[PDB]
Structure 1
Amino acid sequence: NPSARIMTFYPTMEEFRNFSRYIAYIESQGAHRAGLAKVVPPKEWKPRASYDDIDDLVIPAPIQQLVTGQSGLFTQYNIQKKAMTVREFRKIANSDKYCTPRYSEFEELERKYWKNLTFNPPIYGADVNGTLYEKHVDEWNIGRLRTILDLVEKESGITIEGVNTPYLYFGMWKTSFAWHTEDMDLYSINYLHFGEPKSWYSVPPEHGKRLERLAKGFFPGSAQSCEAFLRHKMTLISPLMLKKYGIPFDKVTQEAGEFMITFPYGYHAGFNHGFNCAESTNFATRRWIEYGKQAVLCSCVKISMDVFVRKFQPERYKLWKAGKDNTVIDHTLPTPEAAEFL
């Protein structure tokens, strides 16, 4: 993948049964270079029979997304509103004031998003604790992926909501997710259960530092206030701005029934086309260990790396605790679990 373009994968039912092995396969294919990959599930796979029984589901803290800024540079302020049901959210979403405008091609809707981002603030039904998967679904179940991230809960019982538990996101037109990498630079999985599409922008992890540098120049007050202010998830940057400053990036639209995988240190941002619902959580592979050790956290979610270093890096353990671990990450290298596909 020399241009680090977003790749799409079509596993068979057999390939879909082992989650961790398929992540290892897409890395041996070079998917991790883009920082984002699309996975289309087998036609015989269904995580839920129907979504017509969730109208009374409560969104306890919906947020009004106020956006301030100009010239492709914006700050998003999330204003907590009173709790509302899925039914109440959907009615606002499909109303004359908040529904999706007319569009023939993506570029037209994308132009409309960047032109009207600061106007008529929408409501995002974000960070809802929960799952939409039926109990019996064993394949790609966001509630129980069985990766090495499970070690945190196994050893302490500690749960970090949205990180080692699922989050639901009820979107509407122009709802957004700002530029960020995951907590502890972990991997993420996002499934679009139903509704209108979700568009994504990604910056390859091998160019991640270029975006950080650009963000520091444009918001110097924030950079002096926090070591990793992009973790506040308030910064919106248009693709025209990334193009102007030579930041390599790619874009993709996720449709209902599709998965998106984000990779360690893979910067991403995007927006919802209209009323929809996504389910998400973080996960890990052996390659993540180094990212978690080297991750720059908010200085204004921290996972203890000790258990991971002791279990998967005992040879490099003594050097790390002393502070002499001078390991440099090669963002092009696939996870060691990919060896069988190479």
Structure 2
Amino acid sequence: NPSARIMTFYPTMEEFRNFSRYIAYIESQGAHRAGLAKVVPPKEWKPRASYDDIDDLVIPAPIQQLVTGQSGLFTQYNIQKKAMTVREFRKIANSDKYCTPRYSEFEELERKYWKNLTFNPPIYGADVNGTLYEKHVDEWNIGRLRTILDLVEKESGITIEGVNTPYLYFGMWKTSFAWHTEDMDLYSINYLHFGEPKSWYSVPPEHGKRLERLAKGFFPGSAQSCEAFLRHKMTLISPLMLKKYGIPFDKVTQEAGEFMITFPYGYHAGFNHGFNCAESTNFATRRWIEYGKQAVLCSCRKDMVKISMDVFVRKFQPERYKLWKAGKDNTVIDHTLPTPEAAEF
């Protein structure tokens, strides 16, 4: 993938069943270079029979997304509103006040998002704990992907909501997610259960540092008081700004029934087209371990997610454990490289 453009894959039912193995495969195809890949599941697979019995699902902490700024540079402040059900949410989303404007191509809707994101602030039903997968679905179950990320819970005994457990997100037109990589520069998996699309921007990991330098240059204050301020998930930057400042990036639109995968150190941002629900969690591979050792963490809030790397270094890099404990392991990540489990392909 030497254009490092976002790739789309259409696995057969038989490639689909082994999760970590399909991640290994898409990386043998270079999919990680772009930091984001789409995986369209085989036509007959479905995580759940239907979605008409969730109207009474509670969204404990929904957020109103106030955005402030100009000239394609913005800050998103996420204001916690009272508890509300899926029904109350859908009805707000589908109301004349919040529903999707007229468009006849993505590009038009993109211009409206960037022209209108600081007006009429939407509500996003984000960070809801739960899965919408039926108890019995065994393929790509966000609730139990069975990757090595599982050592945190199984060996360290630590539960981190949204990271090693699943989150649901109820979107409405113009709800957004700011530029970030995942906690600890993990992978993530994102499945759009139903509703209108979700659009994504990605920066290849091999160019992530340029995006940090851009953002640092634009938010010098933010940058002095924290080493990884983008991890606050409050910074929006338009594709025109990226283009203007020579930041390589791609876009893709995710439709209902499709997975998106983000890769370690893959910066992304994006917005929902209308009423929808996505499910997400983080996951790892062998390659991730080094990103975990090297990830640059929020130096400013007492609350942020940090995973102790010891369990992974003892198990998988036993030979380097003391070097590492001794600040002396200094491997350099080559972002172009597939995870070792890719060797078979």
Specify if TM > 0.5: yes
Q: Deviation per CA, 1:208-238: give whole Å up to 9, x if none.
A: 0000000000000000010000000000000
Cα separation, 2, equivalents of 1:3 and 1:16? 26
CA deviation digits over 1:3-26, x for unaligned, max 9? Answer: 100000001011011000000000
- Residue 317 of structure 1, CA deviation: 1.4
- Give the secondary structure class of the aligned counterpart of 2:332: coil
Residues 180-215 of structure 1: CA deviation (Å, up to 9, x unaligned): 000000000000000000000000000000000000
Give the secondary structure class of the aligned counterpart of 1:315: helix
Equivalent position SS for 1:68? strand
| CA deviation map 1:167-190 (0-9, x unaligned) | 000000000000000000000000
Deviation at 1:316, TM superposition (A): 1.6
Residues in 2 aligned to 1:308 and 1:44: alpha-carbon distance in whole angstroms: 37
Q: Which secondary structure state, in structure 1, belongs to the residue aligned with residue 118 of structure 2?
A: coil
Q: Aligned partners of 1:57 and 1:189: how far apart in 2?
A: 22
Identity percentage of aligned residues: 100
**Shift of residue 156 of structure 1?**
3.2
Shift of residue 60 of structure 1? 0.4
Q: TM-score, normalised by structure 2?
A: 0.98
Take 1:259 and 1:17, find their aligned partners in 2: how far apart are those partners? Answer: 14
Q: What is the aligned partner in structure 1 of residue 163 from structure 2? A: 163
Shift of 1:318: 1.6
How many angstroms apart in 2 are the aligned matches of 1:50 and 1:271?
24
Q: Deviations over 1:258-279 (max 9, x none)?
A: 0000000000000000000000
- Give the deviation of 1:143 after TM superposition: 0.2
SS of structure 2 residue aligned to 1:280: strand
SS of 2:289's equivalent in the other structure is: helix
> In terms of mean alpha carbon deviation, does 312-321 or 158-167 score higher?
312-321
| Structure 2 residue ranges without an equivalent (≥5) | none
Deviations 1:43-79 (A, max 9, x none): 1100000100000000000000000000000000000
CA distance in structure 2 between the aligned counterparts of 1:41 and 1:321, rounded to whole angstroms: 42
Q: Distance in 2 between matches of 1:127 and 1:185?
A: 18
CA distance in 2, matches of 1:33, 1:316: 27
Cα distance in 2, alignment partners of residues 26 and 190 from structure 1:
16
Per-residue deviation at 1:315?
1.5
For residues 178 and 171 of structure 2, what CA distance do their matches in structure 1 show?
A: 14
Would you say how many aligned residue pairs link Structure 1 and Structure 2? 341
Q: Deviations over 1:140-173 (max 9, x none)?
A: 0000000000001111331000000000000000
In the TM superposition, structure 1's runs of 4+ consecutive aligned residues that sit over 4 Å from their partners are none
Where 2:179 maps in the other structure, the secondary structure is strand
Q: How far, CA to CA, are the matches of 1:326 and 1:168 in structure 2?
A: 37
Q: Choose the corresponding residue for 2:307, options 303, 310, 314.
A: 303
Partner of 2:12: 12
Q: What corresponds to 1:91 in structure 2?
A: 91
How many Å separate the matches in 2 of 1:306 and 1:142? 25
What are the within-5 Å matches in structure 2 for residues 322-333 of structure 1? Answer: 322-333=326-337
Q: TM-score under structure 1 normalisation?
A: 0.99
Quick check: 2:129–2:168 contact (8 Å CA) kept in 1? yes
CA distance in 2, matches of 1:17, 1:246: 40
Q: Within 5 Å, which residues of 2 pair with 1:62-77?
A: 62-77=62-77
| CA-atom RMSD in angstroms | 0.4
Equivalent residue number for residue 256 of structure 2: 256
Say if 2:344 is the partner of 1:340.
Answer: yes
Per-residue CA distance 1:18-45 (angstroms, 9 max, x = gap): 0000000000000000000000001110
Partner Cα distance (1:71, 1:33) in 2:
29
Contact kept? 2:156, 2:311, Cα under 8 Å: no
